[PDB]
């Protein structure tokens with residue numbers, strides 16, 4: 001199972017880890033991708049997860065978008081986890097660098113409640129531009145299922161743990 005996680009609440013855990021390396025080690029039922037509405041996995045967590053699948057995640061995602069159209073900001077879709085997990089839950093957090101409503105971050109985290117346990121990044125953090133301390137607060141106040149957060153950046157991980165209320 002998951003190892004080396006610091007317990008933050010009854011259901012939220014956190015670790016300084018590369019989510020691709022974490023997924024390969026664990027092979028969780030669900031890995032969360034920090035997706036955009038088009039499922040274009042170019043950079044950040046999405047680019048790293050997609051690159052780990054040898055682009056199979058992007059090919060599957062383009063077929064999904066061709067059939068269904070784009071996701072909503074705050075929405076999600078369940079696709080294959082390829083070599084990383086049983087499933088990938090592609091969740092769209094608001095991208096602050098696109099003027100997207102930061103209030104949609106709570107809606108985005110609500111998608112996690114449809115899964116009993118997940119390996120996930122902090123939504124809207126990184127290249128999405130939101131404050132990761134705020135994202136962690138919304139995560140613990142919204143997600144009721146068991147979430148194992150992987151924070152790539154060690155300095156950000158330390159800041160998140162040391163400032164956690």
Ligand SMILES: Nc1cnc2c(c1)COCC2
Pocket residue numbers: 017018019020044045048121122126150151152153
């Ligand atoms: N937060 C976060 C967790 N893991 C990863 C990243 C970000 C980006 O590089 C790939 C692995």
